[PDB]
Amino acid sequence: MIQRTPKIQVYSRHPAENGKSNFLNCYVSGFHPSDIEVDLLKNGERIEKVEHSDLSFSKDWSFYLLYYTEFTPTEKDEYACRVNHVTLSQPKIVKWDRDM
Amino acid sequence: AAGIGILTV
Amino acid sequence: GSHSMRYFFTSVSRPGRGEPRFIAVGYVDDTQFVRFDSDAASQRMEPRAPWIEQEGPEYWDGETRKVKAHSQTHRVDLGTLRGYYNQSEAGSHTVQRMYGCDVGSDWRFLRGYHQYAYDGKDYIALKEDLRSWTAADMAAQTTKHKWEAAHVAEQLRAYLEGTCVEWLRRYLENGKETLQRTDAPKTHMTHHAVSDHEATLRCWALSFYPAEITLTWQRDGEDQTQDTELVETRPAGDGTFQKWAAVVVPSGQEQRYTCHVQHEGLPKPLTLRWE
In 3D, which of C182, C254, C171, C245 has the Cα closest to residue C215? Predict the structure, then answer.
């Protein structure tokens, strides 16, 4: 079968400012088949209050999904998205980098 | 509003 | 000023783990307005945009019936395609269907589409005339024969050129504050050294709607497409979109590079410079 690797992006909804509530997004796109595991992490621990969008797909049939949670950025706390999919030999962790 | 008359392959 | 309505349906077999997962979603342009998930409690088509919430009981009953009918058809399709491709009972397979219509700035019909995929690949699609089919392999030719004998294209065409456009116009009117808006991108470029001889220049567009946008880098006006990392346009989560494009450049050469942004909310395409 066709398999296509998720392209993973971790980012905030608004420009991030320490102490100011915001939303943390993990957008996964371009994948096939549709079974995928996505967690948002705070200092390496899974955030349990995460919501996700309804499964849809692009013109080339590949899937996309948005996972998201409300968060308040600080100097010290590290955020990441952890994704597993059949195309990945181990889960891929992408760290949130606010200075992009 | 979605379609009707969609058939199996 | 141009718009589209599209419905997307996905069914995934899960042998021994229940009946197929079925998910359906509908969009006007880049805004989702409805969904159905077979694994959800409600077993109803559900609103996902505030302006569709005003539709009455008849609408939601009607859309629920249709979407359940789509689900049942795809359940049958999964067993049928297994037979067409001589595949075993044990593996998981995926069918996807998408259809919809496009209208121009004047809200008159441009084109419609109705396309189907099995396991990530084109299977069968209505051609642009909405009277004939493109079948992508021999199993799909079987499907074409049955669909031609059953006059499927005729009823799809009546929907795509009539009903589809009529509902799209109704949604566009009802949802006008959301759907008829254009938010121009807020642009900037960032610069970060990656060593003492190289720097990443990343051109950003933020807070824009609709999703369609072009971001490009030039060096002395020459396009740098092979050298540009361009990410997929991504949802901010609030109804607007983000995108960036980056190049890694020798330090000292920044002023040779310009970023170019095109979007329907911009009165003029933008050029951002480092001087």
Answer: C245
Instruction: Based on the fold, state whether residues C168 and C214 are members of the same structural domain.
Output: no
Q: Where are the domains of chain A?
A: 1-100
List the subunits that have 3+ CB pairs under 8 angstroms with B.
Answer: C
C90 and C190 inside one domain: no
Q: Which residues of C touch A34 (CB under 8 A)?
A: 10, 12, 94
User: So what's the architecture of A1-100 in CATH?
Assistant: Sandwich (2.60)
CA-CA distance, A19 to A98, in Å (whole number)? 14
Which experiment gave this structure? X-ray
Q: What is the resolution of this structure in A?
A: 1.9
> Is residue C98 within 8 Å of C90, Cβ to Cβ?
no
CA angle C232, C215, A84 (to 5 degrees): 15
Q: Given B1, B8, B9, which is nearest C63 (Cβ)?
A: B1
Q: Which residues of C touch A100 (CB under 8 A)?
A: 190, 202, 244
Yes or no, beta carbons of C23 and A53 under 8 Å apart: no
Cα Rg of chain B (Å, integer): 8
